[PDB]
Write a protein that holds these residues in place. Structure first.
Motif, PDB file in Angstrom:
ATOM      1  N   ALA A 182       0.842  -1.185   0.000  1.00  0.00           N
ATOM      2  CA  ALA A 182       0.000   0.000   0.000  1.00  0.00           C
ATOM      3  C   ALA A 182       0.879   1.236   0.000  1.00  0.00           C
ATOM      4  N   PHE A 183       2.058   1.141   0.624  1.00  0.00           N
ATOM      5  CA  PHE A 183       2.997   2.264   0.640  1.00  0.00           C
ATOM      6  C   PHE A 183       3.408   2.444  -0.807  1.00  0.00           C
ATOM      7  N   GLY A 184       3.469   1.318  -1.518  1.00  0.00           N
ATOM      8  CA  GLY A 184       3.819   1.319  -2.923  1.00  0.00           C
ATOM      9  C   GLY A 184       2.811   2.089  -3.757  1.00  0.00           C
ATOM     10  N   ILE A 185       1.527   1.839  -3.554  1.00  0.00           N
ATOM     11  CA  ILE A 185       0.530   2.555  -4.324  1.00  0.00           C
ATOM     12  C   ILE A 185       0.557   4.051  -4.038  1.00  0.00           C
ATOM     13  N   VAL A 186       1.062   4.438  -2.867  1.00  0.00           N
ATOM     14  CA  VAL A 186       1.132   5.861  -2.529  1.00  0.00           C
ATOM     15  C   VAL A 186       2.341   6.519  -3.188  1.00  0.00           C
ATOM     16  N   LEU A 187       3.498   5.862  -3.170  1.00  0.00           N
ATOM     17  CA  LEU A 187       4.648   6.452  -3.841  1.00  0.00           C
ATOM     18  C   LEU A 187       4.201   6.672  -5.270  1.00  0.00           C
ATOM     19  N   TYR A 188       3.394   5.735  -5.756  1.00  0.00           N
ATOM     20  CA  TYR A 188       2.882   5.799  -7.108  1.00  0.00           C
ATOM     21  C   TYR A 188       2.166   7.108  -7.322  1.00  0.00           C
ATOM     22  N   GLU A 189       1.097   7.345  -6.568  1.00  0.00           N
ATOM     23  CA  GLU A 189       0.353   8.584  -6.736  1.00  0.00           C
ATOM     24  C   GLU A 189       1.151   9.839  -6.382  1.00  0.00           C
ATOM     25  N   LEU A 190       2.241   9.684  -5.635  1.00  0.00           N
ATOM     26  CA  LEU A 190       3.074  10.834  -5.303  1.00  0.00           C
ATOM     27  C   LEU A 190       3.867  11.197  -6.547  1.00  0.00           C
ATOM     28  N   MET A 191       4.387  10.175  -7.217  1.00  0.00           N
ATOM     29  CA  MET A 191       5.191  10.358  -8.413  1.00  0.00           C
ATOM     30  C   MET A 191       4.417  10.571  -9.712  1.00  0.00           C
ATOM     31  N   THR A 192       3.233   9.977  -9.835  1.00  0.00           N
ATOM     32  CA  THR A 192       2.432  10.130 -11.053  1.00  0.00           C
ATOM     33  C   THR A 192       1.350  11.196 -10.899  1.00  0.00           C
ATOM     34  N   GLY A 193       0.967  11.464  -9.658  1.00  0.00           N
ATOM     35  CA  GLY A 193      -0.050  12.460  -9.398  1.00  0.00           C
ATOM     36  C   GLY A 193      -1.445  11.938  -9.659  1.00  0.00           C
ATOM     37  N   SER A 216      -2.017  -4.466 -13.443  1.00  0.00           N
ATOM     38  CA  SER A 216      -0.940  -3.927 -12.625  1.00  0.00           C
ATOM     39  C   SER A 216      -0.729  -2.445 -12.902  1.00  0.00           C
ATOM     40  N   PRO A 217      -0.325  -1.668 -11.882  1.00  0.00           N
ATOM     41  CA  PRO A 217      -0.075  -0.220 -11.985  1.00  0.00           C
ATOM     42  C   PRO A 217       0.944   0.189 -13.047  1.00  0.00           C
ATOM     43  N   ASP A 218       0.488   0.984 -14.010  1.00  0.00           N
ATOM     44  CA  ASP A 218       1.342   1.454 -15.093  1.00  0.00           C
ATOM     45  C   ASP A 218       2.519   2.239 -14.528  1.00  0.00           C
ATOM     46  N   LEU A 219       3.733   1.720 -14.690  1.00  0.00           N
ATOM     47  CA  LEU A 219       4.908   2.412 -14.175  1.00  0.00           C
ATOM     48  C   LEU A 219       5.509   3.406 -15.153  1.00  0.00           C
ATOM     49  N   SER A 220       5.204   3.232 -16.432  1.00  0.00           N
ATOM     50  CA  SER A 220       5.734   4.111 -17.462  1.00  0.00           C
ATOM     51  C   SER A 220       5.223   5.556 -17.409  1.00  0.00           C
ATOM     52  N   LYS A 221       4.530   5.938 -16.338  1.00  0.00           N
ATOM     53  CA  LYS A 221       4.008   7.299 -16.257  1.00  0.00           C
ATOM     54  C   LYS A 221       4.427   8.131 -15.042  1.00  0.00           C
ATOM     55  N   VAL A 222       5.611   7.840 -14.514  1.00  0.00           N
ATOM     56  CA  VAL A 222       6.152   8.577 -13.374  1.00  0.00           C
ATOM     57  C   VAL A 222       6.872   9.819 -13.928  1.00  0.00           C
ATOM     58  N   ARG A 223       6.717  10.971 -13.264  1.00  0.00           N
ATOM     59  CA  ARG A 223       7.358  12.234 -13.688  1.00  0.00           C
ATOM     60  C   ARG A 223       8.763  12.052 -14.269  1.00  0.00           C
ATOM     61  N   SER A 224       9.162  12.987 -15.130  1.00  0.00           N
ATOM     62  CA  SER A 224      10.480  12.950 -15.761  1.00  0.00           C
ATOM     63  C   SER A 224      11.545  13.179 -14.698  1.00  0.00           C
ATOM     64  N   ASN A 225      11.253  14.123 -13.806  1.00  0.00           N
ATOM     65  CA  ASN A 225      12.153  14.507 -12.727  1.00  0.00           C
ATOM     66  C   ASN A 225      12.142  13.581 -11.513  1.00  0.00           C
ATOM     67  N   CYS A 226      11.568  12.393 -11.659  1.00  0.00           N
ATOM     68  CA  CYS A 226      11.537  11.444 -10.557  1.00  0.00           C
ATOM     69  C   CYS A 226      12.855  10.671 -10.568  1.00  0.00           C
ATOM     70  N   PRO A 227      13.615  10.713  -9.457  1.00  0.00           N
ATOM     71  CA  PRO A 227      14.900  10.010  -9.360  1.00  0.00           C
ATOM     72  C   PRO A 227      14.770   8.544  -9.778  1.00  0.00           C
ATOM     73  N   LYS A 228      15.749   8.027 -10.513  1.00  0.00           N
ATOM     74  CA  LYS A 228      15.683   6.635 -10.941  1.00  0.00           C
ATOM     75  C   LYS A 228      15.688   5.722  -9.724  1.00  0.00           C
ATOM     76  N   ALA A 229      16.430   6.117  -8.696  1.00  0.00           N
ATOM     77  CA  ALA A 229      16.516   5.332  -7.471  1.00  0.00           C
ATOM     78  C   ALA A 229      15.124   5.117  -6.896  1.00  0.00           C
ATOM     79  N   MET A 230      14.284   6.138  -7.023  1.00  0.00           N
ATOM     80  CA  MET A 230      12.916   6.094  -6.522  1.00  0.00           C
ATOM     81  C   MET A 230      12.025   5.177  -7.356  1.00  0.00           C
ATOM     82  N   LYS A 231      11.920   5.451  -8.654  1.00  0.00           N
ATOM     83  CA  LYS A 231      11.085   4.628  -9.515  1.00  0.00           C
ATOM     84  C   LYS A 231      11.410   3.161  -9.289  1.00  0.00           C
ATOM     85  N   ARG A 232      12.695   2.868  -9.140  1.00  0.00           N
ATOM     86  CA  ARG A 232      13.159   1.507  -8.910  1.00  0.00           C
ATOM     87  C   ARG A 232      12.625   0.961  -7.583  1.00  0.00           C
TER      88      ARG A 232
END
Length: 264
Positions: A182-193, A216-232
């Motif tokens: 669930a923390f995962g789904i939140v980082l998601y909405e934090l990064m994708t909005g 499954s949650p589309d990962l290809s839509k996280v902000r450009s400025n989102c650190p790679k370490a984070m998306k990972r």
């Protein structure tokens, strides 16, 4: 000892929200407080448990990132008094008024949330209902985790349910790992909005496919400025296979090492 607010000291006012586990009011007890009550004249047996339990879990928490529990009351009616959040839910900011935080205010909200979740887990508590709705941004610069109705010590909000939980596998699906999801789904909405599966409008289908593993949650839509370490990290917390998601301590350390070498 005893957080039983002397009788007749609390005074409820406006009506904030509700649900099935009681209705929330904005009362006053030594200042503004949020009072959660149970109006049904006579407390049924099972309900008196929803109460005793929550209260029992809340009183074990004393951390800056957890909604401060102040006291409970019984005499007038079952009630749980907590501090009054002076802000709005991470949900409301992201999905209703579409606030635009910098990528620092985001990586921070993530840090703080994981900070509190790490805390609850040490004290050996499992939330079981972490959503961008139970995370309030107090004073617009303080993460407060809340809503411990389903918390334990070992609801049509399926967007945050780990698959193993939706699939109600056996009878103890919930676990630190489910919370990490669930923390995962939140980082998601934090990064994708945005919320997940926004393009599907059928609950039964989302519920089904997500537990079945087809969706499954589309990962290809996280902000450009989102650190790679984070998306990972996000993808690691979303792993379809329970036993491969990191626990919070690890998550906390990551969000922190990826926090320094930002930069500006």
């Amino acid at each position: 000892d005893d957080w039983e607010i002397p009788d007749g000291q609390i005074t409820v006012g406006q009506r904030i929200g509700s649900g099935s586990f009681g209705t929330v009011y904005k009362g006053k007890w030594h200042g503004d407080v949020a009072v959660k009550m149970l109006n049904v004249t006579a407390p049924t047996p099972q309900q008196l448990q929803a109460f005793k339990n929550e209260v029992g879990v809340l009183r074990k928490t004393r951390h800056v990132n957890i909604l401060l529990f102040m006291g409970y009351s019984t005499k007038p009616q079952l009630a749980i008094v907590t501090q009054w959040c002076e802000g709005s839910s991470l949900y409301h900011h992201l999905h209703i008024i579409e606030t635009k935080f910098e990528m620092i205010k985001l990586i921070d909200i993530a840090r703080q949330t994981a900070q509190g979740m790490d805390y609850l887990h040490a004290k050996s508590i499992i939330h079981r209902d972490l959503k961008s709705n139970n995370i309030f941004l107090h004073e617009d610069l303080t993460v407060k985790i809340g809503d411990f109705g389903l918390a334990t010590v070992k609801s049509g909000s399926i967007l945050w349910m780990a698959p193993e939980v939706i699939r109600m596998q056996d009878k103890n699906p919930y676990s630190f790992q489910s919370d990490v999801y669930a923390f995962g789904i939140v980082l998601y909405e934090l990064m994708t909005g945005q919320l997940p599966y926004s393009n599907i409008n059928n609950r039964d289908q989302i519920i089904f496919m997500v537990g079945r593993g087809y969706l499954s949650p589309d990962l290809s839509k996280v902000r450009s400025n989102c650190p790679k370490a984070m998306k990972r990290l996000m993808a690691e917390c979303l792993k379809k296979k329970r036993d491969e998601r990191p626990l919070f301590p690890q998550i906390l350390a990551s969000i922190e090492l990826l926090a320094r070498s930002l930069p500006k």
